[PDB]
Enzyme design. Structure first.
Site, mmCIF file in Angstrom:
data_model
loop_
_atom_site.group_PDB
_atom_site.id
_atom_site.type_symbol
_atom_site.label_atom_id
_atom_site.label_comp_id
_atom_site.label_asym_id
_atom_site.label_seq_id
_atom_site.Cartn_x
_atom_site.Cartn_y
_atom_site.Cartn_z
ATOM 1 N N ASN A 1 1.282 7.364 3.056
ATOM 2 C CA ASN A 1 2.054 6.450 3.961
ATOM 3 C C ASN A 1 3.509 6.795 3.895
ATOM 4 O O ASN A 1 4.337 6.065 4.464
ATOM 5 C CB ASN A 1 1.900 4.963 3.529
ATOM 6 N N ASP B 1 0.815 -1.202 0.000
ATOM 7 C CA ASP B 1 0.000 0.000 0.000
ATOM 8 C C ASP B 1 0.845 1.247 0.000
ATOM 9 O O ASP B 1 0.570 2.169 0.686
ATOM 10 C CB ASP B 1 -1.036 0.024 1.121
ATOM 11 N N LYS C 1 2.109 4.690 -1.002
ATOM 12 C CA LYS C 1 1.428 5.879 -1.591
ATOM 13 C C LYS C 1 1.825 7.037 -0.714
ATOM 14 O O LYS C 1 2.346 6.819 0.473
ATOM 15 C CB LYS C 1 -0.092 5.736 -1.531
#
Ligand SMILES: O=C(N[C@@H](COc1ccc2[nH]c(=O)[nH]c2c1)c1ccccc1)c1cccn(Cc2ccc(F)c(F)c2)c1=O
Length: 277
Positions: A135, A130, A132
């Site tokens: 983050n 995840d 992106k």
């Protein structure tokens, strides 16, 4: 040995996968932590609660300058508490929103730190899934600190995790994710730093998946040419052909791409980051 009352709890910093993360200051020291709070009531069979449901977790102890670290744990009758690094300058997404898009020197520096961070994470056999800008946090010194919010996994089909704009075609069509999936997400992030928006955009998530699988995206006219070349070598439908993956001879040729020509790889964490303007 700490407890809830050694701390003043302040603004919520993040949420997800069954927990809240709260800014907190330790009173004796005045020191600031991001405290992940988890209600015990949530810890059950039908739930995959991250970091608690795992027989083995080697992520808990991850300790590298480009990642969030765990400092302490404690409990109360209803909840568990995990003291995490607080990244004083917030999300990289916030700087993309503030300044519209990054110049080439800033794109090169922050892209090299994410590459550096990925190389380490993948060398430990962990994939994020995840990745992106929400983050990728920025500490007080303006270096990155990547955070997991429950999707990272040790390599030993795969869970349907991620965020639609950054998800890989192999996750969608083959139910599989590998190191090379985070390299596809790295290509969307470089695009988004340069262009200001991520490359796969559509009316709804289903429509965005359809653009991913067909490789339907375009570059604005001014996109930095060596960066466009790198993004074209990362956003490749065949996962075994992305620059950086094991079948492409690994991180050496990715770090050796012309867009990174003036980068010194060895000491990024000791370099003064370029001012974001
Ligand atoms: O517990 C860790 N991460 C938390 C989130 O931590 C945050 C969230 C926002 C914040 N803002 C800020 O300033 N500091 C913050 C801290 C988590 C929450 C919910 C489920 C799972 C994890 C956590 C514990 C230990 C190590 N790491 C880093 C990490 C592990 C695996 C990886 F693959 C990776 F890329 C990075 C964590 O993220």
């Amino acid at each position: 040995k700490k407890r809830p009352e050694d701390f003043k709890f302040g603004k919520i910093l993040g949420e997800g996968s069954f927990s809240t993360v709260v800014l907190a200051r330790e009173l004796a020291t005045s020191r600031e932590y991001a405290i992940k709070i988890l209600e015990k009531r949530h810890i059950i069979k039908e739930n995959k609660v991250p970091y608690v449901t795992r027989e083995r977790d080697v992520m808990s102890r991850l300790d590298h300058p480009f990642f969030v670290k765990l400092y302490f744990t404690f409990q109360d009758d209803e909840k568990l508490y995990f003291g995490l690094s607080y990244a004083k300058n917030g999300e990289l997404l916030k700087y993309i929103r503030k300044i519209g898009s990054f110049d080439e020197t800033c794109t090169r520096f922050y892209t090299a730190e994410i590459v550096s961070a990925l190389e380490y994470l993948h060398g430990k056999g962990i994939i994020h899934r995840d990745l992106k800008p929400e983050n990728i946090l920025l500490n007080e010194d303006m270096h990155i600190q990547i955070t997991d919010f429950g999707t990272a996994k040790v390599l030993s089909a795969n869970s349907f995790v991620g965020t639609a704009q950054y998800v890989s075609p192999e996750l969608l069509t083959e139910k599989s994710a590998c190191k090379s999936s985070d390299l596809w997400a790295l290509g969307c992030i470089i695009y988004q730093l340069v262009a200001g928006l991520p490359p796969f955009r559509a009316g709804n998530e289903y429509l965005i998946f359809q653009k991913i699988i067909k490789l339907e995206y375009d570059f604005p006219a001014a996109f930095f040419p060596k960066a466009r070349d790198l993004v074209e070598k990362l956003l490749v439908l065949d996962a075994t052909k992305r620059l950086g993956c094991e079948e492409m001879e690994g991180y050496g040729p990715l770090k050796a791409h012309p867009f990174f020509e003036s980068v010194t790889w060895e000491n990024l964490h000791q370099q003064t980051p370029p001012k974001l303007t």
